[PDB]
Amino acid sequence: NRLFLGVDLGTSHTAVMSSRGKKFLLKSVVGYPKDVIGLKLLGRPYVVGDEAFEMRSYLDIRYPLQDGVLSEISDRDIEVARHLLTHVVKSAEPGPNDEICAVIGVPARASAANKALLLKMAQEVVHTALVVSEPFMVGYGLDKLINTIIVDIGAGTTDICALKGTVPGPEDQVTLTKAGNYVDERLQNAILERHPELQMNVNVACAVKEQFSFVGTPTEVASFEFRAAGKPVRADVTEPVKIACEALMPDIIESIETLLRSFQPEYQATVLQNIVFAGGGSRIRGLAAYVKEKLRPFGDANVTCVKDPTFDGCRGALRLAEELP
Amino acid sequence: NRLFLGVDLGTSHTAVMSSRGKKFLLKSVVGYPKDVIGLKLLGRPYVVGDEAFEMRSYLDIRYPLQDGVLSEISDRDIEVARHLLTHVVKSAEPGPNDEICAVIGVPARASAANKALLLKMAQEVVHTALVVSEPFMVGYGLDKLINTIIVDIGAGTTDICALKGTVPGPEDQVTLTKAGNYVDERLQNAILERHPELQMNVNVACAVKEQFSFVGTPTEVASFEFRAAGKPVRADVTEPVKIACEALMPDIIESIETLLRSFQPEYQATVLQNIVFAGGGSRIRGLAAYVKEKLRPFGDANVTCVKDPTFDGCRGALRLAEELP
Amino acid sequence: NRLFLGVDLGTSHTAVMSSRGKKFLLKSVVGYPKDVIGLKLLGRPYVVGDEAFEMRSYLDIRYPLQDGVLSEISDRDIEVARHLLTHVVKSAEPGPNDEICAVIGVPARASAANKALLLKMAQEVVHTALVVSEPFMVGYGLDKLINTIIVDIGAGTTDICALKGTVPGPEDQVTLTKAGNYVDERLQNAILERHPELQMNVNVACAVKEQFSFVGTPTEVASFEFRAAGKPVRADVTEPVKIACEALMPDIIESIETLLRSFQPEYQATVLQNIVFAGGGSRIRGLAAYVKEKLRPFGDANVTCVKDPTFDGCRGALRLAEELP
Amino acid sequence: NRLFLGVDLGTSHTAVMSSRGKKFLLKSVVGYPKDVIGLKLLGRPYVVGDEAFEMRSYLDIRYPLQDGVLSEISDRDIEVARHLLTHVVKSAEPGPNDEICAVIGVPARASAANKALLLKMAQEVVHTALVVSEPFMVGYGLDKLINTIIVDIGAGTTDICALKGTVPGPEDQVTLTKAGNYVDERLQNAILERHPELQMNVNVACAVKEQFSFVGTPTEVASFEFRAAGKPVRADVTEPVKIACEALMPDIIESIETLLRSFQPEYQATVLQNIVFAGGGSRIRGLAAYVKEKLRPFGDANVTCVKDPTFDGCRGALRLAEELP
Amino acid sequence: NRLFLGVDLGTSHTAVMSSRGKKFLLKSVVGYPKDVIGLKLLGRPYVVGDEAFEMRSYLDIRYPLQDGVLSEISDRDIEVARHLLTHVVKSAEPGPNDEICAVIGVPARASAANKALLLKMAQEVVHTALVVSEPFMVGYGLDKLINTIIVDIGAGTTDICALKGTVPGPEDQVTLTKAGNYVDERLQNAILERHPELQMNVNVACAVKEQFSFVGTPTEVASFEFRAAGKPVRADVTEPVKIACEALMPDIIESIETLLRSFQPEYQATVLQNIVFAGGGSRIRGLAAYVKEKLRPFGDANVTCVKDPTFDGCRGALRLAEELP
Amino acid sequence: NRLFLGVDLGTSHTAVMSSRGKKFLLKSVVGYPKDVIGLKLLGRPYVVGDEAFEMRSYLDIRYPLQDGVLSEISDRDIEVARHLLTHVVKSAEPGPNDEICAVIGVPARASAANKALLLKMAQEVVHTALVVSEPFMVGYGLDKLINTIIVDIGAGTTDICALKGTVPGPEDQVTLTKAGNYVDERLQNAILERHPELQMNVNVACAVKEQFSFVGTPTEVASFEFRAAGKPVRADVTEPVKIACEALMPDIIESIETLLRSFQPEYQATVLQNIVFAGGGSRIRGLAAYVKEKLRPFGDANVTCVKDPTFDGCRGALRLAEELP
Ligand SMILES: Nc1ncnc2c1ncn2[C@@H]1O[C@H](COP(=O)(O)OP(=O)(O)O)[C@@H](O)[C@H]1O
Ligand SMILES: Nc1ncnc2c1ncn2[C@@H]1O[C@H](COP(=O)(O)OP(=O)(O)O)[C@@H](O)[C@H]1O
Ligand SMILES: Nc1ncnc2c1ncn2[C@@H]1O[C@H](COP(=O)(O)OP(=O)(O)O)[C@@H](O)[C@H]1O
Ligand SMILES: [Mg+2]
Ligand SMILES: [Mg+2]
Ligand SMILES: [Mg+2]
Ligand SMILES: [Mg+2]
Ligand SMILES: [Mg+2]
Ligand SMILES: [Mg+2]
């Protein structure tokens, strides 16, 4: 028997669909206990996913992918990734006589090396595996494979991928490193710039951003409970957050504009009425409309942010390997 | 039972009439999907005609005839043509006990080799097939088979054909390569000369030309929405277009003059009052009158551009094989 | 066979648990008889523990640890500590074929020198021995190894130890010298300040404190029978005692505040709802609530004083070496 | 003083002879540098001839003649041609008091328009200029001006020209577009058909063809070093090349047959014993003999391929204007 | 009067040449004193360049460019960059009546945003400024502007730039983030993997790498004096270092291979005999030869590492704006 | 007008410098007469400084700081400290229109409470006052603010302070309680251990120590005139004294080692060549060299004991507030 997988193996969240109807999401992160006590507390030699990030306190949490690309700045990060992947496959619940055929998404324009490392690292766990551009397999998740831009803004990477009809490209892709994560790093700097007394780690501003990110007009008051020398402080982050999230957008815009001019002229109009935002960063409030406005120089853009950014990635992959060799 | 066909198998549009009252037109073009995704998008292994040119984005559209002559610069282009032809016959709707007798038009003075390739390639689909000059079978479509010039200006080829009474000639024919398509290539160069920022492919200027082509006096403002680095730009193409379409005409004129002087002197006066333009290029605005003027040195020309350039080709063929063995 | 020990080797009270179910407590103190008559009275060449402190009159009682750290301000104090330790092991009742594995607590941030001197001095008596922070092994005694402060207020030392998850720290520890004992010294001075006729030694005020210590609101009348020029005098020590015990607290508070601001901001809220007081000084009346109030500037603290301050120290140690190499 | 020129102004090579004993050949091509860097690299504002084609990399090389006819699909191509022509005259080395009388060859049956454009464009550089059929001025180059066919196969055009005695014709000429260049386009398609991994541009297959072209029997192994995804690959092109170059020949043959039947019957036997191949395409291996065989239905052809295809064109022109007004 | 500048504004080292014969190099880094004492120690409100990195101890050293791109993850980093740039211009020594025309290099395929931020930020200091690809302005520094690859491996970025003749590209560029810095991060992880007791910061391994980096065969013993718990330790880093620096190379190779296949086939051979390494990372021992070997599948590469990696960057820029508007 | 003060407010000796050139030293101690006769003898209601310690016989001498920290184990000790401080300011000789700006040193890592109590208690006497780490203000007294350890060994406290560049730390400080005084206590015990007939108070051994303290090799005979049952006895204290003063050192060493491993590895070598001993305990004979030897495991230490331990403390403070707001 055969089981196929959609694995959008994201730098922060790995989503997974299976032919047999698992949707599940998890954090792409593996906790190791830090010492012999951690090991005790944790009750197992490592954790993966959201439990790891709950116990983030007393585990060394290791993201196995940053810049989406599967990491090798340590010989350890290979073992991490093994765990992660082992765990996502295992949490697909399959066997004993189940032949796992998988689709993995990566960042578009992730090197052959890194596609090979995944591919290898999957071909350790699943027998047959397939590595495609996230943004494309998004697009393929919506039948938008034609005269379309996607802009997966994610965490690690904003990928932007003209679906210049069907061939999923490698000059029709683009990736920026300015993505979610960089917004937080920034945001944090934007808050620490103005309430210099604050403690923020990035995991804080991460959450400020998730909760109040927007662009353009501030539609409300962005008030958040930070700490300062340990003391609770409520503070206004409207302006940090504005700044932060409208620091993604320049690059995305310019890099749509760039893809747009790659399409045949007869179709550019039509492309613009197909610009998509998928992935986390596509949940920014007012994004849509901020883009529209940024693109008026190219025409009437109709920008849409997908329905459920959480799975469109895998949804696609899945459908994709519902359908071939 | 017997069914006969008029197939004006043109380089850009293949028109077809049948004895049983199909008129239909289609683009002479066959799309293949480019990759395994295309194949999916397209829903079939190839398309032919105007759907192919809609999906031009993500299909490799292959015209199977350029210079009208049926192409062999690939072993593939034979299969293309098969598809085209298969499809035009099939869209004539005939069977199961229907013996297809066909007339195909070609460019006048298309080589015996090429007439044989069609003929062969039709005798694969229809049982009995007949390949004549387009311009003649136009002329035969209007009872102008005597002391007449036609000038089929088409896409690929302008053919020009003295209907030196009845024998349809091979020194009374002429073909130029400068035809529609060459107007576009040119036009495009004429626009890209002056708004060097523009993108044009030829399929754009094609459309500029269809929409604003004229000769002589510019009767209006030729304003068109081009792209520049992706940005919409409205621009004035009156002068490009003038230039472009009055780059057909020299050769046509000289080649009428040339046919004219082939006729017996007693009749040349009379010929001139019979010059015809058939085919697409005959839709140029002001053509008629521009020719008249070009021909004053030979006399009072009365130049006419046929009633419905779309079918006169096949109309003829049809009538033609309504009437013999 | 193997026997493991929890030895909370405190500066005033050494508690001990064994795997085989001894709990016992004793005073960390060894009496030597003062002279040849003492030796006679005492019936043995030294005592250890509460009998020593009964006979405190006519023995030279030598605490072998002050500031918890095991003392070397005499070459004698090494022999003392031997006796003490010899006696606590021996009162664990083990042999003849018993291999003693021990955990000893010290003050958190006791020097490597002093951990070595214990360690040595235990590795004289037990074969394998382990020296950890008291406060941690408390915390480990309550599964509170995460986002927790403990404050062991003891006699010698108040130790305060963030259980910044599991690694038991050395910037996440703190020790103050102001602890029990310093309260008494003080208290005494606070009583001798106002009833200057009184005799107090510290061993008196030690007992006033044990009996009436509180902080904040005086919940009752602190009347105690002191002497003056030998003459019994009952006197009111409510205000001495208030003063005395609320002279611990500043430092503790400031040093919790300090540890609190060491945790990641995302968790400080959570820490505060985990502040513990263990050890003797944690028996102060109203401590809990006085702390809560001192910490309102950091949030809603939920401060708890452990269930049985007497053993939580060793309890832990025990459990701790119930569980590894 | 007077200086006369043979200029065979070919679509790929322009040869030139002068009365004063220049033979030189050059590529009919003018490089312009592409940008402000090119301009720097090139050291001059344009190049012409073989240096242009060396620097083909970083120049926009523009052939100023395709289909031999002097191009006007750009207003630029007029300036190109100026450069070319300016340069071929200038490289004839003449002045200051030298009156240049020139013979240019064109494709036989190049329109009056195009003969006028050259003629004009020469009468800009030389004072008196003469435009004749290449094939004829070849024939005139060999005293074969009688009962002769030539077949200039060139690059752009195969011209074929009955030398129906002396009047050089315009129903005794013929030109096909299928010539050299079309062999390459084809060849390339024939190689890319079978080693679909290969890169070929036409400039490659051009070179495969020059190096291995033949017809009929493959006299050797046609092995050539192509690239595939950049990787060197040696591959066998014997069958591509067969296919390609025997795709010229049908049209040539049919068009000789056609000229042949134009001659008076008494002479056709004799004509056949005079069929010539001039020009590049006449260098195909085995051509001679392949034709012979193709023409057995007409008799014993004696087909010859001229001695030095490089100059016979101009050689003629030259001689030609060594001899009149 | 006019003064022009070559500013290779690198992420670690900014080199600068002026028309008037300054070469100088500095570290691209600005030290701010950390507190009111730092300010005192430092004697000025900020430092820039190598003094900043000497005083790295007690300054907050802020690189104003990482990933070469000029940073905006802080509103501060703009002021940094101002200082840096102010300082590099000022250390060009020019005025009072000197009009500074500059060339700045960036990473090839740095966004328009970032070219604008520099450009702006230069047009604050110099009046006219120009921002080009480092690798190109290298290539232009060696007349290698044709059928050439460069691979600037630097610190931040390895840029790899086909000099596909002269137009300096934006599909003919490539940048990787795996560059010097990433080697150190890695290396450090590679050493800390094996001598887990070691302290390394990256600034250590940075120096291990500078001193012992190689690839392929270890030509010697890589012994280095690290610290462990403060204690000097000499250790062997041959294998870490191997690992580390041969973790650049995959991406570079693949991305040459990729550029190579972008060139016209006729030239790829020739390209390969032009592959350059410029910039710091080009100082790796045995690089050359390791590449050669990696590229044997594409042919005989002749890889060269430039003469003086320190200035080729600016050298170029300089020459470049020695020569135009 | 403004007058600034260096007050190194030490637990045994308070040194003071003023801007106007007072150096003076005094004992940090206030004598009160014990009774109505003392009051008569003393001639004033209290003394402060060395007269108090002369009359130590018949005054109750109260150090107002032990452990350096300003004492509160009595409500009296606040009045003491007032007197002391009143007297050190007053002996700075300033008024009537003099605004006293002061720097007071404390033990590094003295609690905020205690810094506040001084601060308060100075802001009673001087208008503006500043409380910093002694060891830092030493270091600042020698420009050694960088990659330096100091070890102030004093009386109360040995402070040890990495001058981890400029920010004066609170994890880069350390204080031990084992300092001078603890040496004496010990020494005394070391002499009473061996000449059990002796009387020593600590004030005796204090003086033995001052006079004969050394470490390592005994460079001479330590003979001193003690009493026994009142009877003068000369006795050899070489071995007591060895023992005593080499009981400081372990902790200091371990706590340098500890700070050393806190510095960045690149600098630890360099730190070691900057280890300082300031303060009284730094007068121990052979200290320097004994440390060197203790630290060989970290490298070649170059340990220096400051020039004039008496004032380096205040010297600094002074300079310090010669230089700011
Ligand atoms: N509601 C939100 N608003 C803004 N950013 C968000 C939101 N939810 C998630 N993100 C950001 O988008 C990223 C998560 O999107 P995701 O599709 O998982 O990224 P990836 O799949 O590349 O890991 C993170 O950087 C996160 O902070
Ligand atoms: N001798 C060397 N061996 C290996 N890498 C080196 C060497 N010298 C410098 N580097 C590395 O190359 C980089 C410096 O090169 P550079 O041209 O200045 O980079 P950039 O200009 O992008 O700042 C750093 O990452 C450094 O560690
Ligand atoms: N010559 C000496 N040798 C050893 N210790 C000394 C000497 N002089 C003073 N001391 C000790 O050092 C301390 C005095 O140093 P000091 O800087 O005044 O300490 P503090 O300033 O902390 O009161 C006293 O403990 C004293 O016994
Ligand atoms: Mg994603
Ligand atoms: Mg037609
Ligand atoms: Mg205790
Ligand atoms: Mg020719
Ligand atoms: Mg560089
Ligand atoms: Mg001191």
From Swiss-Prot, chains A, B, C, D, E, F:
Its EC number is 3.6.1.-. ATP binds at T11, S12, D67, A155, G156, T157, K209, E210, Q211, F212, S213, G280. Disruption phenotype: Magnetosomes are dispersed in groups of 2-3 throughout the cytoplasm, no evidence of magnetosome-associated filaments. Cells form magnetite and turn in magnetic fields. Unanchored magnetosomes move randomly in the cytoplasm. Magnetosomes are unevenly segregated to daughter cells. About 45% reduction in magnetosome alignment; a double mamK-mamK-like deletion has a 65% reduction in magnetosome alignment. MamK-like protein forms many fewer filaments. Another paper shows deletion of mamK to yield approximately wild-type magnetosomes. Belongs to the FtsA/MreB family. MamK subfamily. NCBIfam families: MamK. Keywords: ATP-binding, Biomineralization, Cytoplasm, Cytoskeleton, GTP-binding, Hydrolase, Magnesium, Magnetosome, Membrane, Metal-binding, Nucleotide-binding. This is Actin-like protein MamK. GO terms for biological process: magnetosome assembly. Forms cytoplasmic filaments. Filaments are parallel (polar) and double-helical. MamK subunits from each of the two strands are juxtaposed, each monomer binds ADP. At cell poles and septa interacts with methyl-accepting chemotaxis protein Amb0944 (MCP10). Forms filaments with MamK-like protein. One of its GO terms (molecular function) is ATP binding. Its main location: cytoplasm. It comes from Paramagnetospirillum magneticum (strain ATCC 700264 / AMB-1) (Magnetospirillum magneticum). The keyword Secreted does not apply. It is an enzyme of class 3 (hydrolase). Mg(2+) binds at E134. SUPFAM superfamilies: Actin-like ATPase domain.
